[PDB]
Design a protein around this ligand. Sequence first.
Ligand SMILES: Nc1ncnc2c1ncn2[C@@H]1O[C@H](CO)[C@@H](O)[C@H]1O
Ligand SMILES: Nc1ncnc2c1ncn2[C@@H]1O[C@H](CO)[C@@H](O)[C@H]1O
Ligand SMILES: O=C(O)CCCC[C@@H]1SC[C@@H]2NC(=O)N[C@@H]21
Ligand SMILES: O=C(O)CCCC[C@@H]1SC[C@@H]2NC(=O)N[C@@H]21
Lengths: 234, 235
Amino acid sequence: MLGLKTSIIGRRVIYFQEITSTNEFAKTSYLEEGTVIVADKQTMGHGALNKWESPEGGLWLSIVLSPKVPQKDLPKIVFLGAVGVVETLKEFSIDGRIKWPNDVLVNYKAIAGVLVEGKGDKIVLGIGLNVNNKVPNGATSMKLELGSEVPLLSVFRSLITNLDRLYLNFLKNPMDILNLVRDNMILGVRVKILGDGSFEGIAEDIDDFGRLIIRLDSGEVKKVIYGDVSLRFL
Amino acid sequence: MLGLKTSIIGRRVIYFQEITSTNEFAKTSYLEEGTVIVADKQTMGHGALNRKWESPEGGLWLSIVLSPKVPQKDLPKIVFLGAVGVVETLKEFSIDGRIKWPNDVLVNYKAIAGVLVEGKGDKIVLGIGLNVNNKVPNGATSMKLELGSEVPLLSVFRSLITNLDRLYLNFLKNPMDILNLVRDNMILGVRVKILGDGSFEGIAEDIDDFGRLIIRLDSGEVKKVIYGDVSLRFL
Ligand SMILES: Nc1ncnc2c1ncn2[C@@H]1O[C@H](CO)[C@@H](O)[C@H]1O
Ligand SMILES: Nc1ncnc2c1ncn2[C@@H]1O[C@H](CO)[C@@H](O)[C@H]1O
Ligand SMILES: O=C(O)CCCC[C@@H]1SC[C@@H]2NC(=O)N[C@@H]21
Ligand SMILES: O=C(O)CCCC[C@@H]1SC[C@@H]2NC(=O)N[C@@H]21
């Protein structure tokens, strides 16, 4: 009854009033490619590192993918989610910018996060977007940005449509997404990579593998992988 | 993202752009009680007694997984939950739906919806097909045809699920209540023909405490019809 006209993403949609995590369900359940798992609320939502607040009002969903692309391209699925969110936000007159590698900010406030996990040769693309829900201190939502409630289903429709388009092109031209990320991410600013061997520098660009290129004050250039990176804006 | 607030029916909803049959998927798959299977269109829609049910885009084609822990004597009334739920939703949209015993809903004697219940003991599948904005077979009708304009399909879905959830929860508590709702919304007082092992005609007087259709033949003989392997035809 939803009348979705997408090719792959959204062929099937499993909706939950409540769920532990859409990502966990998508990983542990046999689902055909393109199946979307979405819930009004998550009781155990999570993302990069070890919680992702998922109260009623937001868009919490996961997409099952099994892309038949070269091994080295598989890691770029996270960018499809980030760019899809940016495109949807623009449709609603909101300017979102990507905080490499998986977050979307509006005026430097977090409005969405992407988490990609796997199970077998299935890839699960998880996306959390604050719409009308309460958000953690320092974060924002479409409602807070627009000053009014936003029809949640309309956001879902927009995002699924954008993701389907990005995914279909990714299957044929897997390098294209990097250009979209580059033109929509925060660059030219100082950042600090946390953890062992922590360092600071200017976030210059992302390379052909989606690695963040940082120029340290000494002139040294380091390439950061986005598997489970911890980054801070200075 | 649908924000359903129902207790059981609609806890989960599995939507399909296309499916063979929501009833078949529901019967076959491992699903929890209250899960709703809905599709934009069905390629193999089924009606009662092996009939074909046209399910083009524009209509509401869904099935609900139920596991009612009521006495076996009450299980046959589940089809009525579907019929009444549809009637209530139609009234919400100001359409006068009336029940054609025991599983059809008509508007001015034209079929607008059909209900098919399939069970095996514990797991019961309640299937409902309602014509909304889709083209229909000659002689049938739809919400769009009745109102003269397109009706938001999702609005009909929300309405029906809400009604079905309420009806089902009360059914578990008071299994007899549904019978009163069927009586008040069914076509009675007219001549009908009952088709099964042969056939007979008479006035459809009412439904009894078992949901059986009470028919008064011209001779004065009274027959009680149990649904399952029979069809009803208005004269
Ligand atoms: N619903 C949410 N919206 C935005 N950020 C969240 C949410 N839940 C947890 N966070 C975390 O708060 C951080 C914002 O500083 C993000 O990196 C994000 O992972
Ligand atoms: N979508 C539909 N709406 C109303 N009646 C239908 C529909 N599909 C099939 N039928 C009915 O099922 C019967 C054939 O088994 C016919 O009387 C036909 O009109
Ligand atoms: O910002 C991040 O670190 C990633 C957050 C990802 C959140 C979404 S909500 C839908 C899906 N289910 C989860 O448990 N996590 C992701
Ligand atoms: O009038 C009838 O004989 C019953 C028709 C039941 C139609 C619905 S459409 C949803 C569900 N899936 C099916 O294949 N049949 C039922």
